[PDB]
From a paper:
Type 1 pili are important virulence factors of uropathogenic [name] that mediate bacterial attachment to epithelial cells in the urinary tract. The pilus rod is comprised of thousands of copies of the main structural subunit [name] and is assembled in vivo by the assembly platform [name]. The pilus rod is a right-handed superhelical structure composed of ~3.2 subunits per turn with an axial rise between two consecutive subunits of 7.8 Å or 7.7 Å for the type 1 and P pilus rods, respectively.
We modelled six adjacent [name] subunits linked through donor-strand interactions and refined the models against their respective cryo-EM maps. Additionally, we observed peak doubling and/or line broadening for a subset of [name] residues (V17, V23, V37, A69, A72, A93, I103, T128, F154 and Q159) in the in vitro sample. By contrast, pili assembled in vitro, without prior incubation with GdmCl, produced SEC profiles consisting of a void volume peak, a broad shoulder containing smaller pilus fragments of different lengths, and a peak of the unfolded [name] monomer. Following incubation with 4.1 M GdmCl, the smaller fragments became even more abundant, and after incubation with 6 M GdmCl, the pili had almost fully dissociated and unfolded. Taken together, these results suggest that when pili were assembled in vitro from [name] monomers or [name]–FimC complexes in the absence of [name], structural defects occurred in the resulting pilus rods, likely at the positions where small fragments associated to longer fragments.
Author numbering:
A (entry chain F), B (entry chain E), C (entry chain B), D (entry chain A), E (entry chain D), F (entry chain C): 2 to 159
The structure:
Amino acid sequence: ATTVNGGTVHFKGEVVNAACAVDAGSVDQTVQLGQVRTASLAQEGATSSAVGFNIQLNDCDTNVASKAAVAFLGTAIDAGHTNVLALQSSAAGSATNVGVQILDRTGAALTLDGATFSSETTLNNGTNTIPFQARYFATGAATPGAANADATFKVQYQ
Amino acid sequence: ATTVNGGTVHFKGEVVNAACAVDAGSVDQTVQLGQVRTASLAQEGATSSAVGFNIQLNDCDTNVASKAAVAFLGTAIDAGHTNVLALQSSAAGSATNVGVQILDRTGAALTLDGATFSSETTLNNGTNTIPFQARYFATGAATPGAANADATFKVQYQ
Amino acid sequence: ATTVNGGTVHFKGEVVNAACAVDAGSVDQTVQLGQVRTASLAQEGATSSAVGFNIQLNDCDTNVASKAAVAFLGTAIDAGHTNVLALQSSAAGSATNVGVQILDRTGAALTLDGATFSSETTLNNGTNTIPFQARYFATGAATPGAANADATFKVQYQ
Amino acid sequence: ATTVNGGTVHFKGEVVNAACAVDAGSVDQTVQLGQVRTASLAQEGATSSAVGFNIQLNDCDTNVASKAAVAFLGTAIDAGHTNVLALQSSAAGSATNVGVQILDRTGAALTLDGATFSSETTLNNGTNTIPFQARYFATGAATPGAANADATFKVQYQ
Amino acid sequence: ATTVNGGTVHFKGEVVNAACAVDAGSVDQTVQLGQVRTASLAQEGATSSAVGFNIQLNDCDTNVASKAAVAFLGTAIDAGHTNVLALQSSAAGSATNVGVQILDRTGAALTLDGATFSSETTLNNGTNTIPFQARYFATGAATPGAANADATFKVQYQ
Amino acid sequence: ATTVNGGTVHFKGEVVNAACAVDAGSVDQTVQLGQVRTASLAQEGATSSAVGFNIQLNDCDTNVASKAAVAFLGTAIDAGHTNVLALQSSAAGSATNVGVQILDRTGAALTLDGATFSSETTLNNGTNTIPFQARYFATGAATPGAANADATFKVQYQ
């Protein structure tokens, strides 16, 4: 009887030519690292506790590819720390001398060039979960502030 | 003492003469369908796994109306596929022979003309959620690319 | 106390005896198609990915009219391609053998003469948005250059 | 090295002895009102929906002045409607019985004599923005046509 | 080897001499009020449900200032309702007798004169978020339409 | 029946002979730096917190090129600071001794001559995202004011 305007729906997705497809919950996931004390990042090379995040793969076909690796891309904090993400929230409130390190399943920090892939993980037919960890890395004496960071990843099927 | 310029706030809303009001989280929502392999859309009529999204109606009054239906409006991929959304992100990166198909609570695909309303759902006083599903539809051999799409919906109360 | 002259303000608008009124954001809008590779437009009939744009109608009264259609009027690239917009930015830099195609909600290219109206969209009282898509159309081997174009539209109410 | 003629650049500006300075984007701005229906302006005194626009003040010094007001100057539509702008685009095609009203931040229409100043908004050090609204005013039965208008403003500092 | 023109990037920001700095996500934010029924705004003085939004301050120094207040500036709907924002989207389609009220942390509606600051909130070193609410206010029998509004705010530190 | 003039639509884009094409959302994008305090920019060489932005590439073909680099072009603040964007808003109200630095994915600031390309990022078939950061740079004691800036970029494929 009465018809009114409702609104808009935006659909996001991608068609890939690969052995697996990234889950809808892994393409744009947010990782809450929590707070970290300055006393825990009081020197160069100091690290915080790790926070785990996963990249799920769906509809995997082991006949097409047997192993999958992930390479992360982002802004590095320095020219001597290529495996540490630079913080980026705003222009005023952000921690200095602090970055974010992404660790593959072997526990090694991945360099953020978009070309160095992590350790290959064998795939099974179906749903695959690749484990990663993230932590704060101190390039000096840390100062308080926001510690948000962003990165993109690509998956290599071989 | 010290007063500085802060910024600007924009308020978006609508006043409707209807039995229900669309929730602020449903008037403009993003649905992340994730990725789909090209191998899963290798023929005309192929479909992917469905992703659900809801349209929430607030402050519903059953004395005004008891049933609600939703009609979507968007560009169609072809004249032979009038229930398949055409992808629209940019001029370079997009999947070909692929479209987004919107499913109502009965599993049928809705016509994207803004005049074919979904199955009517009984309303109760207060908050009502109308379930919907979105998937990918292949009008041929799919090719890799971005698969973003947009559509608008209206709500009919009777 | 101190009075100085500030400037000038210009107001643009129209009064129409129609069922709806075009929104202020739709009477003069810019659509960013983005870049497209010459490799994707390497032959006659080649098309690019589509970019969407909407023409919003406000204060619609379904008693006056229930269906709305839109015709477009611009310079055609050729007499054998009457649905392709010719590019026009300057005298030096522009793409050759490239045009702009406007697609209505059925996915069909519209003739650019201001007399071939698109598919009639059902109207509801209040805000109405009519979806359109724009893409690049190759009338030959495309060559690099700017690809700016423009057109005027008129709305038919019945 | 080939040297060719390039063209001409014209610089516009003004040196003011005032507390603030009008932004380069506010000295000459175009306000797009959109379309309005004759049915919404079918009687004397009928108003349309308002469209907002701002006049921005830069480099404000509160030590010189603390309050700024704006007076608008233009051709009135009648002797009994001195706060309604007369339309002016060309000798034909303009709307009759329609005018433009500039609304203060208190919602009151401003007299278009260049001497009635608006509400005195309080200034802060730095960028300052004064909100304004423009709407269509019907002095009779509105007729279709173009509804362009122009006005000039001066800023009072005290 | 192949160099092409990419595009343009625009950087927006402000340098302030204040105890805090407004976050990049708070200087220009959109608040989605959602829809409201005319039945909920059927009389003068009727209010809708509130939608919350925050203004975030970064790099706060409690040594410089301990309390922060926010004053909003915009066009008032009338002269008796100086705390109700006037709607402004286009010349047609907006709601009538409907406004937007901004409520501070104490629930009181703020006068939109740009000089009546909200309740003082104590600042802590680092990130501070000031809670605000926005609701709909009826100045009579509400009529259907778009209900967009805009306002600017300034932050006082003392 | 009733046909009225609707308005104008302008299509903007480019045809490029390159390995990738810049996304429509990256050809002309506005990034919000936010506010920054003069206390954080109180000396030459002082920097602010970084704000990230991306240049998305679409329809990438790794058979044409495997790496992409971006060079930015704009007005430098001084002769000794060739990698700091000069602020440009208007004849009044801008900040002094403040500029914008665009940081490569390696964390280094880029020279703004349109010929110093950033570090190459490996490309994959399909959508590619190149990360960048923007911050404020002080060439002296910063003064309050607006801090808007502009720059153009070009992409090298090799």
